[PDB]
């Protein structure tokens, strides 16, 4: 039931995308690491719900790698969120719901504020408004420390669960061990400042709901909640820390559900 | 240069106290372990920016354990204020900088609330708000498996550091052994329920500095972020969980002298 496929847009990028179901639009958007097989049970648990259900991977970043290197350098969320706007033009979906973690955090904001004929809601996890010069520094590395580093990073400081993110195999950490170098020098240092939260006005009374991860340290997204609390958004939290998609894929999916039904019913 | 005596409140209770220092008052209440050592580093260090530091075991924890049922069954942040403003009284303590974590959070800001003209200001740390079954369940087991699922609890998870925590010493520990019990019966069921945060207006405006672990998991006191928030306080985080001036004392003694600092130049 679940297509698997690729296509081209007129900015260079050449997809790869899955697409499972029937009904109003939700679209996956990956965290910074661009690998959609980390949606692959949610995907199926989320169409049978009464959806069609689109992700992709990221430019640059596994099976969506052809690429120019403007789409995967010097990264920004509004960069990210013509790219996304890009697939669902050649997908023919006119409105979506949208989820994404991290930069796919930002991207999704970036969607609803700047596309908002396009975004029925945008459900936003662990934004990242802030530089980090300890992955920051990562860029200037050989590729194989970079993912050296970073596998580590993944598996046991933000996984939320680390049964679950080795399940994912060998054959997506073989992805991802490609990717972490191009998100490293094309990432961490661009994302944060362009977070499209320095104007909490703009996002007041917006179709907007905000979640951190209930195990990750209070550090990490204080300044989400905060923000949230600021422009009356609704924040709350999921288990897990930054891929409750992998860690919790069951809550997960039901949270992306029961949300897209509250905003369908808010819309009638 | 430390005071180390006892004092009797005419309430029923004799407190064991410690003073160091002159000048404007700061006064450490502990958290609900009740154990006043755990800031014996932290007074020292306070003391010699220039001000007179209070602390004490709470009633029936500690070197404070001659008191009536009543202070330590049924515990709610309104009694330990009215058992706090006792023993400032006794002591001849007029106006007081308060510093409380956890059902001490609660203590200091039902100081500030209902002894306005006694409290300086109030910094409040990671406030109970929640009934946690699995804590509220511990009351019901013997005294030796209450002690030894709490000390592990603090041990292992929420110290916010094991070596710190460990190098409190023997004796301390010994008289955490028999507080656990105490603290299991008296507090967990109660406190939550008696958080002065109901009103948020009430906070608005109040010389309140509020902080949260930086270690602690985000679900811990995600509510005390956004309450901090609606209602305008400062909020802010410290290294470690639950017990910085255990984990961090410097960092917290810093915190403590400059947050007085602070109240003392805006009062003027
Ligand atoms: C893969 C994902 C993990 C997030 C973990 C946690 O949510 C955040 C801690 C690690 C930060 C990751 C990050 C930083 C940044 O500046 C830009 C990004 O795209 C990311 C990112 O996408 O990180
Ligand atoms: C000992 C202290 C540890 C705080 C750990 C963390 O700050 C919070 C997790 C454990 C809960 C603490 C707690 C709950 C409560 O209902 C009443 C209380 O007096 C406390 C309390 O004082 O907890
Ligand atoms: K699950
Ligand atoms: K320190």
Not at 112 to 139: F, Q, V, W
Not at 202 to 231: C, H, M, Q, Y
């Amino acid at each position: 039931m679940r297509t698997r496929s690729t296509i081209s847009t007129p900015n260079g990028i050449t997809w790869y995308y899955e697409q499972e179901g029937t009904g109003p639009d939700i679209v996956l958007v990956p965290d910074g690491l661009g690998e959609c097989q980390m949606f692959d049970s949610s995907v199926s648990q989320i169409a049978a719900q009464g959806f069609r259900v689109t992700t992709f991977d990221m430019p640059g970043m596994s099976r969506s790698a052809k690429a120019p290197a403007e789409t995967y350098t010097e990264v920004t969320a509004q960069k990210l969120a013509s790219y996304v706007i890009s697939i669902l033009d050649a997908l023919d979906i006119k409105h979506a719901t949208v989820w994404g973690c991290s930069s796919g955090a930002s991207t999704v904001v970036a969607l609803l504020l700047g596309y908002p004929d396009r975004i029925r809601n945008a459900m936003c996890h662990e934004l990242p408004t802030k530089l980090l010069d300890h992955l920051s520094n990562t860029a200037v590395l050989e590729d194989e420390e970079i993912s050296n580093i970073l596998a580590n990073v993944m598996l046991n400081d933000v996984s939320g669960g680390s049964e679950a993110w080795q399940a994912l195999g060998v054959e997506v950490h073989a992805r991802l061990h490609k990717n972490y170098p191009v998100w490293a020098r094309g990432y961490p240092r661009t994302i944060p400042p362009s977070a499209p939260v320095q104007d909490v006005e703009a996002l007041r009374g917006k179709p907007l709901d905000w979640t951190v991860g209930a195990a990750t340290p209070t550090e990490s997204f204080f300044d989400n909640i905060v923000t949230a609390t600021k422009a009356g958004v609704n924040i709350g939290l999921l288990p897990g820390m930054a891929f409750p998609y992998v860690s919790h894929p069951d809550v997960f999916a039901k949270y992306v559900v029961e949300t897209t039904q509250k905003h369908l019913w808010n819309s009638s």
